[PDB]
Amino acid sequence: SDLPAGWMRVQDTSGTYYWHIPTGTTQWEPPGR
């Protein structure tokens, strides 16, 4: 809940990325707070 609405943190072998559930967007950059 430390991310903006709709975002979740995903862990993979190389690190953590971010997934925006409503769109399916994924990105390495933190989406903010």
């Binding site: 979740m8 995903v10 993979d12 990325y17 997934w19 399916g24 994924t26 990105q27 390495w28």
Partner: peptide
Amino acid sequence: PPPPPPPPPL
């Protein structure tokens, strides 16, 4: 079951 989250960018 529901699928894994989408993969990250390359």
